[PDB]
Amino acid sequence: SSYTSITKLTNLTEFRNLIKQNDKLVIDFYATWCGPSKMMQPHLTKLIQAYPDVRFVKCDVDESPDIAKECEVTAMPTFVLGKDGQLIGKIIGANPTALEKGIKDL
Amino acid sequence: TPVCTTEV
């Protein structure tokens, strides 16, 4: 799969359930107009294929402000990492290297 | 740059 094909979160309950139901998770908070978030799309696709044990999803901050707020997302892209039922990390910015390091540590 | 910030 790819950036284009992953689930795009639109609901809070869905978001909360996702944290509870996935052992390893990454959420890509983005904006359609943000250049840096756009730049990370190819990278995410590579990461999705590279780390099949991790669930990757995305959320449009403009479309779902409630979700973004819940994660205190002020800047994009923000990648929120979750492990064993809870959120445990953030990589803020289009840094593919930092993002992969974070994913590897899950 | 690598980030977009939003001030509301």
Swiss-Prot record, chain A:
The entry's keywords: Disulfide bond, Electron transport, Mitochondrion, Redox-active center, Transit peptide, Transport
Cysteine disulfide links: C34-S37
Catalytic residues of the enzyme: C34 (nucleophile), S37 (nucleophile)
Name used for this protein in its record: Thioredoxin-3, mitochondrial
Residues spanning the membrane: none
Subcellular location per the Swiss-Prot or TrEMBL entry: Mitochondrion
First-to-last residue of the parent protein present: 22 to 127 of 127
GO molecular function: disulfide oxidoreductase activity
Domain Thioredoxin: 1-106
UniProt source species: Saccharomyces cerevisiae (strain ATCC 204508 / S288c) (Baker's yeast)
Sequence similarity: Belongs to the thioredoxin family.
